């Protein structure tokens, strides 16, 4: 309902039609899946140590090269 905080640990690379999306790896900080590491797509500038708020934690982005 209020989402789950996750923390950025690694930057993978840019993607998207116009290069506007970045793929990152995050570690969940709260909820049922605390501690798990999954990769995600993020819009906007981001750096290591940022914290995202996820509305769901069972979708994982397709790996890029």
């Amino acid at each position: 309902d209020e989402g789950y905080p996750a923390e950025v640990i690694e930057i993978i690379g840019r993607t998207g039609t116009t290069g506007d999306v970045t793929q990152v790896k995050v570690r969940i900080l709260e909820g049922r899946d605390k501690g798990r590491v999954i990769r995600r797509n993020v819009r906007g500038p981001v750096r290591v140590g940022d914290i995202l708020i996820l509305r769901e934690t069972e979708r994982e982005a397709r790996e890029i090269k």
Partner: protein, 214 residues
């Protein structure tokens, strides 16, 4: 009109505009915490020295960010509430004294109506107006489709501030309300999750559309 004690006001402590302290203001959202800057500062005017460096806007006091956001025309090349708003020669572009006065009067109104520290109410508004999920576009067969993605905290803050400023701008255009009153109304409504606020409705719509395209 304005009493002489206000025309010639002299401070003695480092506090926002010499009138409000920000020591008891706290931020609930864990993601926005390291991006809302609340260090003590007297004058919110830094002369644009932060635009050169990457991530440099992080260490700019939040009141100055609001002042910069409202220093605009408002509806140049996209429509807001169904209209272009082209003011041109009668806009606030590069007039930072008038924007400062507008923000000050809005803060006084907020303090009068709700009895709380105006910075706290502003923080609540930007917390409630920051979206958490966005979308990107792809093209197939000559048709455009949406794909849901996540938002970084800096972009969340930027979008929230822009939407608040746009709502205030739309409420005073060719109506009897003044700019300071519209800004106060918008901030109060966003702080109470009222759908009549432009920013809150925009956030709801963005999140709904993102959800319907996972």
């Amino acid at each position: 009109a304005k009493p002489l004690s206000e025309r010639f006001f002299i401070p003695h402590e480092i506090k926002v505009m010499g009138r409000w302290s920000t020591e008891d203001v706290e931020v609930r959202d864990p993601s926005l915490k390291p991006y809302i800057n609340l260090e003590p500062r007297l004058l919110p005017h830094t002369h644009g020295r932060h635009a050169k460096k990457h991530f440099g806007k992080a260490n700019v006091h939040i009141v100055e960010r609001l002042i910069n956001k409202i220093m605009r025309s408002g509806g140049s090349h996209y429509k807001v509430a169904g209209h272009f708003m082209r003011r041109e020669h009668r806009s606030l572009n590069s007039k930072k004294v008038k924007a400062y006065e507008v923000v000050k009067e809005a803060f006084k109104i907020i303090e009068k109506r709700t009895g709380k520290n105006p910075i706290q109410v502003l923080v609540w508004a930007i917390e409630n107006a920051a979206p958490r999920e966005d979308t990107t576009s792809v093209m197939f067969g000559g048709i455009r489709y949406h794909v849901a993605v996540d938002i970084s905290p800096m972009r969340r803050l930027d979008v929230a501030l822009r939407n608040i400023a746009l709502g205030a701008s739309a409420k005073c255009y060719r109506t009897k309300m003044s700019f300071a009153e519209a800004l106060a109304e918008e901030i109060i409504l966003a702080a109470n999750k009222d759908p009549k606020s432009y920013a809150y409705s925009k956030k709801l719509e963005i999140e709904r559309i993102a959800e319907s395209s996972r």
